[PDB]
Design a protein around this nucleic acid. Structure first.
Ligand SMILES: Nc1ncnc2c1ncn2[C@@H]1O[C@H](COP(=O)(O)OP(=O)(O)O)[C@@H](O)[C@H]1O
Ligand SMILES: [K+]
Ligand SMILES: [K+]
Ligand SMILES: [Mg+2]
Ligand SMILES: [Zn+2]
Length: 531
DNA sequence: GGGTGGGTGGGTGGGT
């Protein structure tokens, strides 16, 4: 990674043009960090990689150089919805751009072939899928014609991490992308990513056939964000009631995002907020372009106070004054929580990132991520983050990214740093042994136990055929019992067993590998609790 | 409801 500070200047022959395009066309006041340096490197004909979180402004760094020189710019995008979002943004600004996919019509494809070789074409950005590069020789001929006529001089690889076989959502089409730099060397290539391991980025640089390439990585810590974990109520109605209470009592008239586990939860939370007077709008990638346009127009003009989105893909929400991000359910991974909560506070003002931790959300996500080879591990990391009540949230978050060393002070910007409290290590070893006895009783009865049935047997509820006479009621609230069960499952005293049924995958609880260590009577299991 | 209607339709429609 060569030093980007040498490029944070406007002494280049194109500096006036760059400033003109930034202020008069894009209607932005100031450059965000690493934007000017990456744009200057791209205009210098040098290859560059930009590791910037989602919502940071990665698109501008390749959209602006296109306007700073004659001709268009080729963009490689893996999804069509992303191309549509970029096209909507560019059409709102009056910039001529186009896209090509497998579902495009013949007349549109032929028009693109004509505009690529047109001398007086107004096109500046052409988004295409990698299949159009790999499985279209005619498009390759038109691309060569545009290269030889100096119709395009720069290439943008959105989600460049996909070129690596190690990167997320690797595409076999992405394997062939080295032909781009192999056939058109005079075109400066800029790769963009938000999820970037160092080895992954080096592998992508190898695949794209790039020898020297600057690599600019944005800062990890965001000093203006406040992180907090709250308990998710057992019912779904008091949850919306408390959400409305918070929104009206702390963020009255302030914009916000609500992330839901399922798209159905997103729609339901939208309906509940609307019935309770909160101006809400549902958003996800499955929306039609007309619905997306209407919700985005309502969001920009502040007609909608809260955008309720799904976590799976709802990533068209670009607004700098996001004052609060509320997670209806916990995120699937720590990387996902960082990327999803980072949407707030892009105006560098104080923002809140609240997460409601629910016991059932654990298993709801566990059943979903069963095919992922390491999904249970990331979900358990998220669970351990939620369980903690003393440790700083920034330390817990930085521990999950080995690629970054973050030593910035929290400065009372997390729930645990505040609330100056004192803690004990409550023993739960007898509770663990009682739960193990229940599991053995169920195992000899040839019945599988969901977490609900296990907690019902622990409390003395449910059907009496699942009972053990030696187990005493823990005389504790249900949320504390759920926390105790979660502590046992994380420490591998309990394990998850997945059953594949016709409607969905179900999660059951079984005796973990460490339960045998309970044979020692002196063995102790402790958990942090406030005094 | 019926499961010879199908699993991307969605479990929160309901009941198999
Ligand atoms: N210098 C800037 N100042 C203010 N807002 C910016 C700046 N650069 C980008 N933005 C805004 O940030 C939003 C999100 O950027 P986006 O294109 O989503 O980046 P990414 O490629 O990382 O997703 C855009 O809507 C854009 O208006
Ligand atoms: K049905
Ligand atoms: K059915
Ligand atoms: Mg993007
Ligand atoms: Zn802190």
């Amino acid at each position: 990674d060569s030093s980007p500070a040498a490029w944070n200047k406007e002494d280049f022959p194109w500096s006036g043009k760059v400033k003109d395009i930034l202020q008069n066309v894009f209607k932005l006041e100031k450059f965000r960090p690493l934007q000017l340096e990456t744009i200057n490197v791209t205009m210098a004909g040098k290859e560059v990689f930009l590791v910037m979180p989602t919502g940071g402004g990665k698109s501008l760094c390749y959209q602006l150089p296109a306007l700073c020189s004659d001709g268009f710019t080729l963009v490689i995008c893996p999804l069509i919805s992303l191309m549509e979002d970029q096209l909507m943004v560019l059409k709102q600004l009056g910039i001529s751009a186009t896209m090509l996919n497998a579902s495009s019509s013949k007349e549109h494809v032929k028009w693109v072939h004509a505009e690529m070789v047109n001398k007086n074409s107004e096109l500046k950005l052409i988004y295409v899928t990698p299949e159009k590069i790999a499985k279209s020789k005619m498009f390759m001929s038109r691309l060569e014609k545009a290269y030889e006529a100096r119709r395009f001089t720069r290439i943008a690889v959105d989600e460049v991490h996909c070129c690596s076989q190690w990167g997320h959502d690797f595409r076999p089409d992405y394997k062939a992308l080295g032909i781009l730099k192999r056939q058109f060397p005079n075109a400066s290539l800029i790769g963009l990513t938000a999820t970037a391991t160092n080895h992954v980025l080096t592998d992508a640089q190898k695949i794209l056939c790039i020898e020297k390439c600057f690599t600019f990585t944005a800062s990890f810590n965001r000093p203006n964000l406040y992180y907090e974990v709250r308990q998710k109520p057992s019912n779904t109605e008091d949850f919306i009631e408390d959400i409305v209470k918070l929104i009206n009592g702390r963020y009255k008239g302030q914009s916000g995002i609500i992330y839901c586990f399922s798209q159905k939860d997103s729609e339901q939370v939208t309906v509940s907020l609307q019935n309770l007077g909160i101006h809400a709008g549902a958003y996800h990638a499955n929306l039609e372009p007309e619905d997306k346009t209407t919700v985005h127009r309502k969001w920009s003009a502040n007609e909608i106070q809260v955008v309720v989105a799904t976590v799976a893909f709802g990533m068209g929400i670009d607004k700098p004054d996001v004052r609060f991000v509320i997670h209806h359910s916990m995120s699937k991974s720590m990387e996902n929580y960082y990327q999803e909560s980072g949407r707030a506070g892009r105006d560098d003002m104080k923002a809140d990132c609240i997460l409601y931790y629910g016991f059932g959300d654990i298993f709801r996500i566990s059943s979903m991520v069963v095919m992922e080879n390491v999904g249970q591990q990331k979900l358990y990391e998220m669970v351990s983050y939620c369980q903690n009540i003393s440790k700083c949230r920034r330390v817990l978050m930085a521990q999950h990214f080995d690629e970054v060393w973050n030593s910035e002070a929290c400065n009372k910007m997390c729930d645990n740093c505040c609330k100056d409290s004192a803690f004990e290590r409550k023993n739960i070893t007898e509770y663990c042994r009682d739960l193990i006895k229940i599991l053995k009783q169920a195992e000899e009865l040839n019945e599988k136990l969901t977490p609900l049935k296990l907690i019902d047997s622990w409390m003395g509820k449910g059907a009496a055929k699942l009972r053990v006479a030696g187990v005493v009621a823990p005389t504790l609230p249900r949320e504390d019992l759920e926390k105790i069960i979660a502590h046992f499952l994380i420490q591998q005293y309990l394990k998850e067993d997945y059953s594949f049924t016709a409607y969905a995958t179900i999660s059951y609880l079984k005796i973990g590998p460490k339960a045998n260590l309970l044979n020692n009577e002196a063995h102790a299991i402790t958990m942090q609790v406030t005094k």
